[PDB]
Amino acid sequence: GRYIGPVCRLCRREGVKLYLKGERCYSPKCAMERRPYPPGQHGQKRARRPSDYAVRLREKQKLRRIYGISERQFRNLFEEASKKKGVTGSVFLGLLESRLDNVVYRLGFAVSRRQARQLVRHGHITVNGRRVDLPSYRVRPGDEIAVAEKSRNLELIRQNLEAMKGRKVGPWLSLDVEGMKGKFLRLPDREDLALPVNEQLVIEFYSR
Amino acid sequence: DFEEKMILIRRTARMQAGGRRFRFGALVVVGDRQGRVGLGFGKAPEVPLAVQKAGYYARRNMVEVPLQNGTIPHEIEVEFGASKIVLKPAAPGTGVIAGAVPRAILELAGVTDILTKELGSRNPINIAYATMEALRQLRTKADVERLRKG
Amino acid sequence: VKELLEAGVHFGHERKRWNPKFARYIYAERNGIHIIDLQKTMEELERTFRFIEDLAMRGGTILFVGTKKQAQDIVRMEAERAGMPYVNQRWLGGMLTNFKTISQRVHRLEELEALFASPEIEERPKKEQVRLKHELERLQKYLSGFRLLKRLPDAIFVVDPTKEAIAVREARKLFIPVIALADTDSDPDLVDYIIPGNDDAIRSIQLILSRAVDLIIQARGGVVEPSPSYALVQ
Amino acid sequence: MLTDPIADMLTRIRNATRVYKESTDVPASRFKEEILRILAREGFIKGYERVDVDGKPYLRVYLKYGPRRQGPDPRPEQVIHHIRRISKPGRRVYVGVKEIPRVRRGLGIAILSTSKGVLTDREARKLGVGGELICEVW
RNA sequence: AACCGGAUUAGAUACCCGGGUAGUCCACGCCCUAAACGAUGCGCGCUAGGUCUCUGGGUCUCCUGGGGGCCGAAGCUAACGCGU
RNA sequence: CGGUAAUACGGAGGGCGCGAGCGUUACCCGGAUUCACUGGGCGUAAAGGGCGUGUAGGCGGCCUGGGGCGUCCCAUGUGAAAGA
Ligand SMILES: [Mg+2]
Ligand SMILES: [Mg+2]
Ligand SMILES: [Mg+2]
Ligand SMILES: [Mg+2]
Ligand SMILES: [Mg+2]
Ligand SMILES: [Mg+2]
Ligand SMILES: [Mg+2]
Ligand SMILES: [Mg+2]
Ligand SMILES: [Mg+2]
Ligand SMILES: [Mg+2]
Ligand SMILES: [Mg+2]
Ligand SMILES: [Mg+2]
Ligand SMILES: [Mg+2]
Ligand SMILES: [Mg+2]
Ligand SMILES: [Mg+2]
Ligand SMILES: [Mg+2]
Ligand SMILES: [Mg+2]
Ligand SMILES: [Mg+2]
Ligand SMILES: [Mg+2]
Ligand SMILES: [Mg+2]
Ligand SMILES: [Mg+2]
Ligand SMILES: [Mg+2]
Ligand SMILES: [Mg+2]
Ligand SMILES: [Mg+2]
Ligand SMILES: [Mg+2]
Ligand SMILES: [Mg+2]
Ligand SMILES: [Mg+2]
Ligand SMILES: [Mg+2]
Ligand SMILES: [Mg+2]
Ligand SMILES: [Mg+2]
Ligand SMILES: [Mg+2]
Ligand SMILES: [Mg+2]
Ligand SMILES: [Mg+2]
Ligand SMILES: [Mg+2]
Ligand SMILES: [Mg+2]
Ligand SMILES: [Mg+2]
Ligand SMILES: [Mg+2]
Ligand SMILES: [Mg+2]
Ligand SMILES: [Mg+2]
Ligand SMILES: [Mg+2]
Ligand SMILES: [Mg+2]
Ligand SMILES: [Mg+2]
Ligand SMILES: [Mg+2]
Ligand SMILES: [Mg+2]
Ligand SMILES: [Mg+2]
Ligand SMILES: [Mg+2]
Ligand SMILES: [Mg+2]
Ligand SMILES: [Zn+2]
Numbered sequence A: 001g002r003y004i005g006p007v008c009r010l011c012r013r014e015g016v017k018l019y020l021k022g023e024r025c026y027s028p029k030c031a032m033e034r035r036p037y038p039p040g041q042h043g044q045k046r047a048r049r050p051s052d053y054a055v056r057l058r059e060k061q062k063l064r065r066i067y068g069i070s071e072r073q074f075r076n077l078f079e080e081a082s083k084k085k086g087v088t089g090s091v092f093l094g095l096l097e098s099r100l101d102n103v104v105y106r107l108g109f110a111v112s113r114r115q116a117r118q119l120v121r122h123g124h125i126t127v128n129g130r131r132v133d134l135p136s137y138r139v140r141p142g143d144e145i146a147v148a149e150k151s152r153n154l155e156l157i158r159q160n161l162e163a164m165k166g167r168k169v170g171p172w173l174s175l176d177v178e179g180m181k182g183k184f185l186r187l188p189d190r191e192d193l194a195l196p197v198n199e200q201l202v203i204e205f206y207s208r
Numbered sequence B: 001d002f003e004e005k006m007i008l009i010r011r012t013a014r015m016q017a018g019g020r021r022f023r024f025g026a027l028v029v030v031g032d033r034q035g036r037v038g039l040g041f042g043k044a045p046e047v048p049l050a051v052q053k054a055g056y057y058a059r060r061n062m063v064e065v066p067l068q069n070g071t072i073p074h075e076i077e078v079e080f081g082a083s084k085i086v087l088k089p090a091a092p093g094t095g096v097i098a099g100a101v102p103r104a105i106l107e108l109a110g111v112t113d114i115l116t117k118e119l120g121s122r123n124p125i126n127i128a129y130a131t132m133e134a135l136r137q138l139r140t141k142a143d144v145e146r147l148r149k150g
Numbered sequence C: 001v002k003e004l005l006e007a008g009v010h011f012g013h014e015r016k017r018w019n020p021k022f023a024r025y026i027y028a029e030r031n032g033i034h035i036i037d038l039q040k041t042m043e044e045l046e047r048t049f050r051f052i053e054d055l056a057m058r059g060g061t062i063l064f065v066g067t068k069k070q071a072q073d074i075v076r077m078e079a080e081r082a083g084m085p086y087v088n089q090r091w092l093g094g095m096l097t098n099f100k101t102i103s104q105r106v107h108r109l110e111e112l113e114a115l116f117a118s119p120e121i122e123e124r125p126k127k128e129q130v131r132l133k134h135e136l137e138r139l140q141k142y143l144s145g146f147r148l149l150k151r152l153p154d155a156i157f158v159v160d161p162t163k164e165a166i167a168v169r170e171a172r173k174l175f176i177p178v179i180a181l182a183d184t185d186s187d188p189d190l191v192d193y194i195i196p197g198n199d200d201a202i203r204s205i206q207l208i209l210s211r212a213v214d215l216i217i218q219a220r221g222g223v224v225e226p227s228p229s230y231a232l233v234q
Numbered sequence D: 001m002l003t004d005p006i007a008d009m010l011t012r013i014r015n016a017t018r019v020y021k022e023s024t025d026v027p028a029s030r031f032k033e034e035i036l037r038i039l040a041r042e043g044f045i046k047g048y049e050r051v052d053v054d055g056k057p058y059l060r061v062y063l064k065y066g067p068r069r070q071g072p073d074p075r076p077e078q079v080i081h082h083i084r085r086i087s088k089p090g091r092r093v094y095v096g097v098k099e100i101p102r103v104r105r106g107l108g109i110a111i112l113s114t115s116k117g118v119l120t121d122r123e124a125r126k127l128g129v130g131g132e133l134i135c136e137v138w
Numbered sequence E: 001a002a003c004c005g006g007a008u009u010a011g012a013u014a015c016c017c018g019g020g021u022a023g024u025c026c027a028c029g030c031c032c033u034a035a036a037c038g039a040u041g042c043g044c045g046c047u048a049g050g051u052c053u054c055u056g057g058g059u060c061u062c063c064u065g066g067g068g069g070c071c072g073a074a075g076c077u078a079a080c081g082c083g084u
Numbered sequence F: 001c002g003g004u005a006a007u008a009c010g011g012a013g014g015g016c017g018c019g020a021g022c023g024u025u026a027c028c029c030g031g032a033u034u035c036a037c038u039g040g041g042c043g044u045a046a047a048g049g050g051c052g053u054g055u056a057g058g059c060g061g062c063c064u065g066g067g068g069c070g071u072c073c074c075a076u077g078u079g080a081a082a083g084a
Helices: A010-014 A052-067 A071-083 A088-097 A100-106 A113-121 A155-164 A199-205 B047-059 B100-109 B124-136 B141-148 C020-025 C038-058 C072-081 C099-116 C126-142 C165-173 C202-220 C228-232 D005-018 D030-041 D121-126
Strands: A125-127 A145-147 B003-010 B013-016 B019-022 B024-031 B036-044 B062-064 B076-080 B083-089 B114-120 C026-029 C034-036 C062-065 C155-158 C178-182 C193-196 D023-027 D045-053 D056-063 D083-085 D109-114 D117-119 D131-137
Touching (some): A010 A052, A052 A071, A052 A199, A100 A145, B003 B124, B024 B047, B024 B100, B036 B047, B036 B124, B076 B124, B083 B100, B083 B124, B100 B114, B100 B124, C020 C026, C038 C202, C062 C072, C099 C126, C165 C178, D005 D030, D005 D056, D005 D131, D030 D109, D030 D117, D109 D121, D117 D121
Parallel strands (some): C155 C178, C178 C193
Antiparallel strands (some): B003 B024, B013 B019, B076 B083, C026 C034, D083 D131, D109 D131
16 A cells, blocks of 8 residues: 655655646645745754765655655566666666556646556556556556546546647657547657656665 | 765864864865866864865865776776775666765766775775775776887 | 087096986996996986977076085076076975965065165164064075076976985976986986986086076077186186 | 796796886796797787896896876886786686686786697687686786 | 791881702703794795995905895885885 | 753654564574685784604696696587476
């Protein structure tokens, strides 16, 4: 069971806007607006120069919390990237980007990561014609991510796709907005991600 | 232009009649991440002034590091006193795998991928000194070629 | 601007206190004294004076440094014959590495001179009058040749790199090229451009420095009469 | 008696260059000669030549060094920074062709003695043979 | 040494003073320790010099071997220091 | 750490770390180049045997030739399945 609770507090504890709240991380209520300091009683106190360990810790958390994942799956994915051929740094990101929940969010089907997770969990997502209710399902390139026609008439899907009209999509993705289709064209490159995260620091958090 | 990061500060009290009277030691690295690093060690009766001196000495005593793709031309060991430092090149997607001290030095050198071991004495000052001398001893295929040309 | 028959003066020196590194410039041991190979000297003299003329006609500053009781007055006169600064009485710790700090002392020198040419000398008490009197006296003792160094010299000339090695250490450290008159007791490795020969024996020092300054002025086209220093031979 | 002539020659060279000697003599042995051929061929020494010292045959090794340098310690960089005997008596080191090291990530050499002659690590690799690992030079 | 006295001392089972047995010496046989120290195993080869000295040889200001010292190149050492 | 202002005890508020788990004890490897083949040492830090003679063993100057035991190369059989 993933992290469930106040989220726009981690927006603060990381120091960077975390869009896990979906909307309202855009409207000036995110609490990253006019409250950029971390939570707690000592939040407005002057923070001490962090330890070298502290830096790689806050970078890993900054990424982990972004994708909304337990430490377990997070580290197993990382070690998977450490074994695979290619740059561990970008391979890991391509793997996190390949989560079905993350793709759903990325395809604009859901406002947020969490919402994408619930949408997958409840089987509203099609993959190549088949229902898939696992947020962890690894999307491959060439997979068609659709919306179950059962739910196509639901007002939350039409609500989000309504604002997806004319909105542009990631260069490794493409979607048809009327038929509620979508496709994973290829793995994203480092440059394909705007993630405010230094991968090297994370790799360097796991060398210990 | 020039980025500095600090290694350690210490208390180094000295004795005198009536009581102790302390200096402050500061180890500071200064690098451009472009292959130029420099190390300085300052002492002063207050912490900040000592740090200043360390930065000023770090801009003197500079080292031209021959990076090859964010890593090193060849592996070297260097013995400084009783402290031995071991640097080995690393393929990309590796990171700086190094102690606290050589991590700081290598990072400000612009090294993004390297393998490292501290050996013998682990003293921060000698480990820094040893890292610097190690970097002074790096040589490029160009440099070796021009050394055995004749 | 050369010499050949100068075997008539400078043959050798330093009976058996030799630096072994000087062995490359030794001809033999005659009557229990090291006699310096004559031809070798002129080789190093060509290579040295080439650098001298080049640096001179470029406009560079050369610090002439000599404290030997043999070379004091010579260094004074020949360094004044050129536009070059000298060090005569004692080479002070830091004159190059602390050049800023030592320069402050020349500012005090000029300050007290300009207060000694003003009517205010008697405006101050008698005791301060004697004090500042002493300040100007010793300042003008040490910095009389060091006065005109505005920046760090572009070269250094030393007459015994063994006794003046405290200077050569600082020229080394700051990468200033080092020109030296070095006999058998000297480490030649530390000298960038060497002239092997007696560090003692005024007769030969006057020749070497006189010719050197001559070449200096010849680089800039200010042709000069014989050097006034020849009367210091006796 | 001289215990390991090769370590002795390696060392004569090491010491000789540490004081920047122009030349140095080492007692003549064909195997030594074949080593000096690789040092020469690889530009580590100026060269060598046979000589007679008081009737007995030696090899004059002419060493080379880099340029005289800048401020203090003008002493040149060395050409032979590191010479080390590897397979000594009483602990012998033979390598198969897949056991042959890469010396200084390329920039040095490993003199092998092979059944096909005294080769460098590159020569012995491209020749497809291994043998006794004589020494590192770099 | 032990021991017998005389002193000193708060005490004196000691330092100081008067004595004195083993022993210290010899032979022969045991014992096998040690700050048994260069606190540095032996052999060979290579790496600046200068100086004092013991003892050989030489065409004998000196050159050349073998010992014993002191400074010190390169280098080594944590440092002290080591350094043909 | 605590002997009157405790960020170390006890509670609370708050925060960090993991999360159907979280901590603890035991045991194994790691860090430990701290048994040093890779990869350590012995003047003063722990470590040169009190000294010699010498047995076994270890080690072996220069040239050539035979052999091909170690060494190196090629082919081939083997190296079960699982695991990796
Ligand atoms: Mg990888
Ligand atoms: Mg793509
Ligand atoms: Mg690891
Ligand atoms: Mg060392
Ligand atoms: Mg050591
Ligand atoms: Mg230790
Ligand atoms: Mg370079
Ligand atoms: Mg003075
Ligand atoms: Mg002299
Ligand atoms: Mg006169
Ligand atoms: Mg009594
Ligand atoms: Mg009594
Ligand atoms: Mg008493
Ligand atoms: Mg004794
Ligand atoms: Mg030993
Ligand atoms: Mg014997
Ligand atoms: Mg002696
Ligand atoms: Mg005699
Ligand atoms: Mg004796
Ligand atoms: Mg002797
Ligand atoms: Mg030294
Ligand atoms: Mg000594
Ligand atoms: Mg010898
Ligand atoms: Mg109270
Ligand atoms: Mg209280
Ligand atoms: Mg208290
Ligand atoms: Mg508390
Ligand atoms: Mg606690
Ligand atoms: Mg508490
Ligand atoms: Mg609580
Ligand atoms: Mg689970
Ligand atoms: Mg458990
Ligand atoms: Mg353990
Ligand atoms: Mg181990
Ligand atoms: Mg142990
Ligand atoms: Mg242990
Ligand atoms: Mg040890
Ligand atoms: Mg003791
Ligand atoms: Mg001991
Ligand atoms: Mg002994
Ligand atoms: Mg003992
Ligand atoms: Mg043999
Ligand atoms: Mg045998
Ligand atoms: Mg044969
Ligand atoms: Mg065979
Ligand atoms: Mg097989
Ligand atoms: Mg199998
Ligand atoms: Zn937010």
